[PDB]
Amino acid sequence: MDIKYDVVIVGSGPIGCTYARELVGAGYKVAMFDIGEIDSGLKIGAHKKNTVEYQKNIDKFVNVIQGQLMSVSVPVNTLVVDTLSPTSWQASTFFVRNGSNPEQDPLRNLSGQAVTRVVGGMSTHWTCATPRFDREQRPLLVKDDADADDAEWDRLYTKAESYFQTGTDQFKESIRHNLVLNKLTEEYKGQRDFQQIPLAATRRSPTFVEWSSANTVFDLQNRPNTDAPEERFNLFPAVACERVVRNALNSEIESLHIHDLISGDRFEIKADVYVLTAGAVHNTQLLVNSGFGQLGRPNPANPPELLPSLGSYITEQSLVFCQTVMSTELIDSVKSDMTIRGTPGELTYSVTYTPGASTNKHPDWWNEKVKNHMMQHQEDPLPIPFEDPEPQVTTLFQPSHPWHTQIGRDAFSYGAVQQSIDSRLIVDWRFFGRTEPKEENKLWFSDKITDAYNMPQPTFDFRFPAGRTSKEAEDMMTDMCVMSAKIGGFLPGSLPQFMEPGLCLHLGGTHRMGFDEKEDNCCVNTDSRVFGFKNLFLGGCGNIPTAYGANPTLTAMSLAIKSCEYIKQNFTPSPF
Amino acid sequence: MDIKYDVVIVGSGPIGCTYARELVGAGYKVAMFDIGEIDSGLKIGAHKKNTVEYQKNIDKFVNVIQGQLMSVSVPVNTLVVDTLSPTSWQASTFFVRNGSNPEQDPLRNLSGQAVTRVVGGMSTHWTCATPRFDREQRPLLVKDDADADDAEWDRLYTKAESYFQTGTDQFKESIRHNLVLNKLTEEYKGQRDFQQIPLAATRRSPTFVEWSSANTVFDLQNRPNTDAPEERFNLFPAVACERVVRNALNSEIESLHIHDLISGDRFEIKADVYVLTAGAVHNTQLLVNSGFGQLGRPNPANPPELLPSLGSYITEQSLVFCQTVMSTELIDSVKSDMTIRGTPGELTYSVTYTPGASTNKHPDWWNEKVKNHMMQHQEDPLPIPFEDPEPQVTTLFQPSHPWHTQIGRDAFSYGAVQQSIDSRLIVDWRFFGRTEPKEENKLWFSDKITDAYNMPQPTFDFRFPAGRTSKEAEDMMTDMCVMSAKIGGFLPGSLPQFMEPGLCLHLGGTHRMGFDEKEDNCCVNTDSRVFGFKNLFLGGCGNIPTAYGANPTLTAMSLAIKSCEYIKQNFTPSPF
Amino acid sequence: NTVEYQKNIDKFVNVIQGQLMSVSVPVNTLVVDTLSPTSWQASTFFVRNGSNPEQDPLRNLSGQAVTRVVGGMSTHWTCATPRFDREQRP
Amino acid sequence: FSYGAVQQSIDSRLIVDWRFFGRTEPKEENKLWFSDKITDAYNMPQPTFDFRFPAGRTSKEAEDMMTDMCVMSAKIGGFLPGSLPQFMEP
Ligand SMILES: *Cc1cc2c(cc1C)Nc1c([nH]c(=O)[nH]c1=O)N2C[C@H](O)[C@H](O)[C@H](O)COP(=O)(O)OP(=O)(O)OC[C@H]1O[C@@H](n2cnc3c(N)ncnc32)[C@H](O)[C@@H]1O
Ligand SMILES: *Cc1cc2c(cc1C)Nc1c([nH]c(=O)[nH]c1=O)N2C[C@H](O)[C@H](O)[C@H](O)COP(=O)(O)OP(=O)(O)OC[C@H]1O[C@@H](n2cnc3c(N)ncnc32)[C@H](O)[C@@H]1O
Ligand SMILES: *Cc1cc2c(cc1C)Nc1c([nH]c(=O)[nH]c1=O)N2C[C@H](O)[C@H](O)[C@H](O)COP(=O)(O)OP(=O)(O)OC[C@H]1O[C@@H](n2cnc3c(N)ncnc32)[C@H](O)[C@@H]1O
Ligand SMILES: OC[C@H]1O[C@H](O)[C@H](F)[C@@H](O)[C@@H]1O
Ligand SMILES: OC[C@H]1O[C@H](O)[C@H](F)[C@@H](O)[C@@H]1O
């Protein structure tokens, strides 16, 4: 390993990989460190759902997600167990046990918040939904010129969409997708528009989708290599980055202190440019461990030297969820263009349709797939083919329905997987609310309790704010109940519910962007540069300072792209 | 991908890798195919528990196991869901839904039986317990010469242990391990012997154990490479192997028909030697799909032409389980040697001991870790260090207690993890019974229903035989209850129970070994060669024809080693 | 109408449950495959514990129950007595 | 007449129950009949139901009744975890 790089990036998630792709490509000498290890196959940091096996058994993938979601703060446990044998050892108190955080108020937590430590970060498991924010949800990159701001966002999002391979066509031939899309489109005719959820993914075959990931942004291969002989990049896994060292004036970072988890060695790495893309929780941790913000329980009477807004104004989305069982009317409608004679399972049975007829409700490709299913499988009481892909439907956030929606099938199931109801009939509903940024909603770090990596224990103090956030969240619930009913009734065991706070994993605003540190209560400027510091940048959803409902990663990547433009303008690459 | 090889091996689990290690090392041009993918880090086929993150969060690893255990045979669901909305599509019958298997009698199943399809097979998640079988549990390799039979098993087992890196001292300085070991040794003094579970594992650090896997046996890198420039090996993942093609004379295999899951194409691969190591269920399936045994529901009236014992005499072990909460007595004994000064928490408290004192109940390494824990953490009410490894205790199968036992902490938890009870108090108990082989116990494959890879659906017809197998299982349950109580009372939520049949994943005898096809009711001889066929071999637990309690993989590997000696004598490698 | 029930109203569900005897219970087909190998075990889902083998589980009023006490179900009911409007009324 | 375990963490003063009841079209095919072989606990012919909620108006109204309860109840408060909106056993 070297002493000296042009750029060091902490984290190999998709935002770290945006920095690598831009900067490695512009000829910089780059080092990237990740605390986790390579475990997606030979494609480093690729999506773990891209196996033939997982896509043939998609109900098993929730186990992969759960296997790499380590809860951020778990309050001390007060469950009463009073049926132990009298011979068994017991304490007299609910003591600090099993890694629990005694700092944590269990009634002001994001109990669902979790972090992932593997190369490629959470993008090794994510859903790949990559919608744009509309103006209402989106921070300003230019003030008092709406159209210049629009132009800037379009340019950045479009680039971000190409890095992720975002598209809205991958589910276009699914019967279930179109069944639900078309019904919703008809029902809300000229009140709401419906489309495919924009997905970072390329379809390989009718039965396989290559989901995008960090690896899609940047392959993570060490460089120079035969394909990139003039490029310079080293990935160092199993390396806990612990502190950036500030000069006395607080105007520059002088080194990054790391801990090699395999050898146990501790080094200081030198770079011209330090980029922190370790996640919304862990960027905050690392900065606090470095003397930014304030360590320990908040105390106003001791304002911090640097970045007093660090860990304040945190946001996380309210999430409501249910599943439905497709209505008889919609199932019957799948076979509306068919002529069905005789009795299934006998040689007199037949199913036909008229090709190209304009009274047909469905296209030929639909009617052919129904025909073939019904004729080849006459034991089956449903008209939907067995390998039909799932719906992937959304009506994006608008001011009159200020929530994001995802309607279809999600690998991240939240309860035991039902087996009594045919999976073809099941549609999932997830609506995501925006949360107002409020100073009192905080991520902070213990001065005494440490985590499994001996760094300061994260602790949340969060409640969904009264006023607009709370009113929207409940109207969002009612809207899900109202809309889902147009498709079918609720599946027992998946009735409408709010999910645990933070189960979303869309936390933002932990190290938020604005134009002015004081007036905008923020930590980085629009170049993602930490105020005061020449050479320290933050990347990730932690930057986003607004109340947003839609999935944030595309927006974070867009920001990282703009940040890299500043870097190219102000630092020169070392000669090869 | 060439068209011609010396040896083709189906499956990259530890038994296929044994064939690889032996025949690649001997100069053969070998190809190995696996229906699954490289998913598991840069060490191809390695244990997935070998990450810093999993060993810092071992309670998460159950998720990785669950995520790659795909149920073999799920009977049609008859759960009544009578609270759907009246507008939802509702079933009139319990029809065949969600990949369930209508051939399956739910009351004669191995419901717990499951398969793993990833490079390295189940050795990417297994517990790594590798005991030897004593005579009583073990098939004969030599007739009429018990001492010759024993010497041959010693020779094979010793190689096998070397390939897996089996050892019995990786947990020797664990306090919990010795706490339970010593207590059971004393309680059963002169009656039974206790020891560490033999484990395929090398300790690297006091908090990390490099668990062995297929990778340990054979690293799975394509050859030639720098380190082995005269060897020839190719691994082809994502290739479903479907049939071995018999010549009309049924004396030889002419090719292996494969389906490349990525391109979708099907090819015929030619080899001199064909080795099937696809696991106990899938070797059988591949054979039946190739014309061996009998496809479809068993029908005696029309006996099969080849291998009429295939899929018969199957054995699976009974498994009882519980967890206990450590007795007050044993916890207090942990600190028996300490001198304790003052009262916990101030600059004044002191904990000390005398190294070497004859009055000491525990060694110096034990007291030192204890002392240190009680001084670095005076708030903690327990004397067990936070980083102390789990117990790994067994008393091995004997005539007077004919069950294998594993006592400690298994990463394969069967219910939600308790967080109310301190984990350092918890000890798991897994006792495993042996099942007599009976012709009526069967694994067979549907002539109509197919699985996710369009192969004949597997179906169990199984019950634990009445008589000794059943009497022994119930006796085993009482023994766990009686033995466990010497350590502590049961943990609510983990009360003593029989696990689902097949949850063991120790299925044997599906393609069983013996000396004489007819007299021993078997499919392969002691070279693992399929009777009548010059160039087809089967490896794996499916070969083991006896009633066994202990974990079978080491014994399967031993048989594979012997098989390789035959191949090496009877086939010549192609020139390089 | 006891002081003790109206002081502990949460408890009266037990009284209701205790005198609702189910009308028709279909034959049970739950799989229990973790019995000890020594215990007597069914080969079939035979008619057990009062179940009715005539009853299709899927065309049932499973929640239907009856009460056999003097005063019948009025000994536990909710006492809601609305009139029907014409729409609902014979 | 509570349907699930009585929850204890939320102050009972905050809790409001909602029950909305639909009307069911009378249909000849919806039947209560009595076995000629099976008997009940008083040795009388065992009752058997053959019942589905009629398609059409009864079904439409039932789903609409659910939606109305989600809409109405939200004016008072959000759903209590464990008593989420659900159809009860027929
Ligand atoms: C788990 C999850 C996540 C999302 C979806 C579904 C599920 C179940 N679905 C999804 C998401 N977001 C979208 O916009 N759309 C979707 O459909 N999910 C969230 C998404 O996954 C995240 O927003 C995104 O990855 C964040 O990218 P990032 O800022 O690059 O952050 P990551 O957490 O992915 O990666 C950071 C990284 O750094 C490491 N690390 C952490 N601490 C350290 C230290 N101290 N030193 C070194 N490295 C560190 C990690 O190990 C990790 O790889
Ligand atoms: C899952 C597990 C299993 C074990 C333990 C714990 C758990 C949770 N613990 C354990 C075991 N056994 C031991 O002796 N001791 C213990 O502590 N477990 C069982 C052990 O894991 C197995 O006995 C062993 O791997 C079997 O080895 P194998 O005979 O080589 O078989 P695998 O199942 O490992 O590998 C088969 C392999 O071939 C593939 N495959 C399947 N079908 C096909 C077809 N048609 N074409 C091509 N390839 C195919 C798989 O994908 C797989 O990798
Ligand atoms: C259990 C229940 C019932 C009602 C509500 C709440 C609950 C949990 N609440 C309620 C009801 N109705 C309302 O209009 N408003 C609400 O708030 N419930 C229904 C109500 O309880 C019934 O509709 C009402 O009692 C019916 O009155 P009935 O026609 O007089 O019938 P009962 O079932 O009350 O009593 C009949 C009776 O005769 C007996 N019996 C049964 N078979 C025989 C035979 N062969 N021989 C002799 N006697 C027989 C019973 O034992 C019983 O006492
Ligand atoms: O569980 C909440 C999640 O639900 C959906 O899968 C979304 F796509 C994702 O952005 C989110 O994290
Ligand atoms: O859950 C059953 C499992 O329990 C223990 O882990 C044993 F090591 C293993 O051989 C077995 O498969």
Author numbering:
A (entry chain B), B (entry chain A): 43 to 618
C (entry chain D): 92 to 181
D (entry chain D): 454 to 543
Please give the exact wording used by the authors of the publication that reports this structure.
In this context, Trametes multicolor pyranose 2-oxidase (TmP2O; EC 1.1.3.10; for a review, see) is of interest since it can oxidize both β-D-Glc and β-D-Gal to the corresponding 2-keto sugars, which are intermediates for production of D-fructose and D-tagatose. TmP2O is a homotetrameric enzyme produced by lignocellulolytic fungi and has been assigned a role in lignin degradation. The reaction catalyzed by TmP2O is of the ping-pong type involving a reductive and an oxidative half-reaction. Therefore, to evaluate and compare the productive and competing sugar-binding modes for oxidation of Glc and Gal, we used crystal-structure analysis of 2- and 3-fluorinated Glc and Gal derivatives bound to the TmP2O variants H167A, V546C, H450G and H450G/V546C.
The H450G/V546C variant combines the two mutations H450G and V546C, which individually promotes Gal turnover. However, the overall Glc-to-Gal selectivity ratio for the V546C mutant was increased relative to the wild type. By combining the two aforementioned mutations, H450G and V546C, a third enzyme variant was investigated that showed increased Gal conversion and decreased turnover of Glc accompanied by slightly increased binding constants for both substrates, leading to a Glc-to-Gal selectivity ratio that was decreased relative the wild type, but higher than for H450G. When the competing binding mode (3-oxidation) is concerned, there is a clear difference between the more “wild-type-like” variants H167A and V546C compared with the variants carrying the H450G replacement. That H450G and H450G/V546C show identical stabilization of the α-anomeric configuration of 2FGlc and 2FGal (3-oxidation mode of Glc and Gal), while V546C does not, supports that this is a unique property of introducing the His450→Gly replacement, and independent of the mutation at position 546. Since the structural integrity and conformation of Thr169 is crucial for proper wild-type catalytic activity, its involvement in coordinating the O1 hydroxyl group of 2FGlc in the H450G variants is interesting. Conceivably, this interaction leads to unfavorable conformational restriction of the threonine side chain, forming an α-anomeric trap for Thr169 that stabilizes the competing 3-oxidation binding mode, and may prevent the substrate from rapid dissociation and re-binding in a productive mode. This is expected to result in an overall lower turnover rate of Glc 2-oxidation for H450G and H450G/V546C relative to H167A and V546C, which is also the case. In the H450G/V546C mutant, the selectivity ratio with O2 as electron acceptor shows a 27-fold preference of Glc over Gal.
